[PDB]
Each structure stands twice: as structure tokens, then as C-alpha cells.
Amino acid sequence: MKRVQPCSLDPATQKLITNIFSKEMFKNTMALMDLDVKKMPLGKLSKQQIARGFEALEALEEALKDGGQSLEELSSHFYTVIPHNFGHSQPPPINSPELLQAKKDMLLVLADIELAQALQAVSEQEKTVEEVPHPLDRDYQLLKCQLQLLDSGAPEYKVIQTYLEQTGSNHRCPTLQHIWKVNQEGEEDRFQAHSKLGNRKLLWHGTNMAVVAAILTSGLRIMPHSGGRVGKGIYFASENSKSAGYVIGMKCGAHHVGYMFLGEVALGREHHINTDNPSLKSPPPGFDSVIARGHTEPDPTQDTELELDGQQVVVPQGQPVPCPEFSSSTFSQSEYLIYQESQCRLRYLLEVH
Ligand SMILES: C[C@H](NC(=O)CCc1nc2ccccc2c(=O)[nH]1)c1ccc(S(N)(=O)=O)cc1
Known part of the structure; x- marks a missing residue:
């Protein structure tokens, strides 16, 4: 059983660190971006999935600018890669520059949520040491x-x-x-x-x-x-x-x-x-x-x-x-x-x- 060392941080800084690594915060943000957190939990988010979403948006962009796939078909592919929630109605087709950029922006934000999750992964040195920092110290140190x-x-x-x-x-x-x-x-x-x-x-x-x-x-x-x-x-x-x-x-x-x-x-x-x-x-x-x-x-x-x-x-x-x-x-x-x-x-x- 490892010792948890006392926190070195002042109250305001502990609050900041709590807030910017908060799982509720991250899931709230995903909900505000219309993502389906049930299908895309924080721990399941990966770089590969995010990269595949950007490939799907790249195909959409090319379609928007032939006999290629319809915007609906290509939108459907994006929405399979990055699950969205619109109270279990169909998600909307990505058929304007403005909507394309809004999905790009969503993924840029999602990429930084995944970065924060990856940052928090426990290292092997941390499993071997017999004392660990307080979790808010650990999180501060990771930055x-x-x-x-x-x-x-x-x-x-x-x-x-x-x-x-x-x-x-x-x-x-x-x-x-x-x-x-x-x-x-x-x-x-x-x-x-x-x-x-x-x-x-x-x-x-x-x-x-x-x-x-x-x-x-x-x-x-x-x-x-x-x-x-x-x-x-x-x-x-x-x-x-x-x-x-x-x-x-x-x-x-x-x-x-x-x-x-x-x-x-x-x-x-x-x-x-x-x-x-x-x-x-x-x-x-x-x-x-x-x-x-x-x-x-x-x-x-x-x-x-x-x-x-x-x-x-x-x-x-x-x-x-x-x-x-x-x-x-x-x-x-x-x-x-x-x-x-x-x-x-x-x-x-x-x-x-
Ligand atoms: C989509 C989100 N964009 C913003 O947060 C823009 C914020 C912003 N835009 C401004 C535009 C004009 C003037 C001022 C601002 C500003 O203060 N913030 C974003 C979030 C993350 C990233 S990342 N992971 O590539 O570094 C890129 C973009």
C-alpha cells in the first residue's frame, strides 16, 4: 500500500487542476458538441479514431468543392466514426463550409480532450515507487x-x-x-x-x-x-x-x-x-x-x-x-x-x- 504524499498546491491552484482534468467537464464539453458520450467514453477515445474522423471530413470537403459519394453517404461515414447524439434522431448532413468547419473545430477540441486522457495514463515508474504524489500534484506535474x-x-x-x-x-x-x-x-x-x-x-x-x-x-x-x-x-x-x-x-x-x-x-x-x-x-x-x-x-x-x-x-x-x-x-x-x-x-x- 503506497503512501499518498500531502498536496503542495494552494487552494486556487488545486481547484484549477481539478477543473481542467475533470471527467465531468470533459463529458459536458462532448455533450455540448453533440457527441454521444455513451458510445465514445473518455477512456475509449483514441488518436486513430480522431484521425479517421479528419479523413472523413477531408472526403466531405473534397465533395463540397464527379459521380462520387453523396454528401449524405459521406456524412454517414463521419457519423459512424465519431458517434453523435441528437436524441436518437438522424444526425444532419454536413453540406456547407460553415458546418464542415464546425465539425473540424469539434474534432480539434476532441483531440485535446484525448491529449489530456493520454497525459493521465499511469507510467511504469509510478507503479513501482512506494510513495505517490497527491493526485492534484501528479496532474499539475504532468503539464x-x-x-x-x-x-x-x-x-x-x-x-x-x-x-x-x-x-x-x-x-x-x-x-x-x-x-x-x-x-x-x-x-x-x-x-x-x-x-x-x-x-x-x-x-x-x-x-x-x-x-x-x-x-x-x-x-x-x-x-x-x-x-x-x-x-x-x-x-x-x-x-x-x-x-x-x-x-x-x-x-x-x-x-x-x-x-x-x-x-x-x-x-x-x-x-x-x-x-x-x-x-x-x-x-x-x-x-x-x-x-x-x-x-x-x-x-x-x-x-x-x-x-x-x-x-x-x-x-x-x-x-x-x-x-x-x-x-x-x-x-x-x-x-x-x-x-x-x-x-x-x-x-x-x-x-x-
Ligand atoms: C476550435 C478551438 N478554437 C478556439 O478555441 C478558438 C478560440 C478563440 N478564437 C478567437 C478568434 C478571434 C479572436 C479571439 C479568439 C479567441 O480569444 N479565442 C480550438 C481548440 C483546440 C485547438 S488545437 N487542439 O488544434 O490546439 C484548435 C482550435
């Missing part, structure tokens, strides 16, 4: 990501709170509960490659609770089937309200808990666009980033800076104001795009209610 909870008077704390408050929704701004500093080392080496590149900004990235463990383990990633209104890159926002739209939170007790990242992004020379371009795979030549510019932007006259690893990083502090040059943009709020994973380092994780 290979240093988290340090910040208190009120950490130098950046007020700056981050201000960014959240001034750029979050005016009527029901998310309520800040915790901030952690995030150090995923060996993001370090690849990030140091952009050390010459100025124009760094701290930007919001909101996400599903179900992908937080994966992000902490592996950083923000660009995968083969990722897409959106500015193409195949990593998406950020300068307005918390925009990123908060992507936060899938979870009911815990009387409240709704969600997580948002702050990334330091080396934007370099910006290419500004004012119309959607879902086909982009890089900036144009001589540019380091693409900014889909919104009707509004956090008032640039109120920008401050933080010093992170000896570099100045801009942090907006202003309420959003109108930008006359982009009053006719297809974007209400800006989307900031990088097309190399190396141009972002995770810096902070916020718990918001």
Missing part, C-alpha cells in the same frame, strides 16, 4: 508548466485587472477571481528566436475549459484543419469581450467558471485587413502578423507596458474607441493573427466568473 498564483500586489496585477475591466463587456464584465503567471519552459527557446522582433503586445485568448490542459502542456498551436475568418493561424483579441465569446465555462455551484489566457505576441510588422480572408496561411511578404482590424480598438493613448524577460510588452488599458479608418470593416472587433507558434509565449491564465 510540465509552472503556474504561480499572483496576489493583489504582484507588479502586473492591477495592469491585468485594468485590461480586463476596461476592455471587457460594459454591462456584465467577467469577474476576476485568480491570475496565474504561466511559464511553459521551452516555449522559451523558440520564443527567443523572435527577440529582435519588436512590437510585442499582450493579447487575450479565450477558450474551452476542455483544451486548457492541452494548451498548458503544448502551448497555443496551429493544426492542419484549423481555420476561421483570417485563415490558419493563432487568433487573439485586444478586447477581452471578443475573446470572452469563445469561453466555454462550466456551472460550479451557483456560479459559471471560465478560463482565459494572456499571451505575449511578437507581432513585428503588421499587415492590416478590413475584410474576411479565411484562405490565409501566412502574412504577406515582409510582414510578421495579420490584424483584422475592428471598428473599435482599446484607446491606444492609454496603452501601458510590462517588462517580461527584459522585453517591453504593450498592454492596452483603454476602453474601446472608434477607429475612423476601419469604420466599414467586416470586423466589429480586431482579430490578431500569427502564423508561427513561436511568435506567442503564454504569460498569464485568468479564472473569471
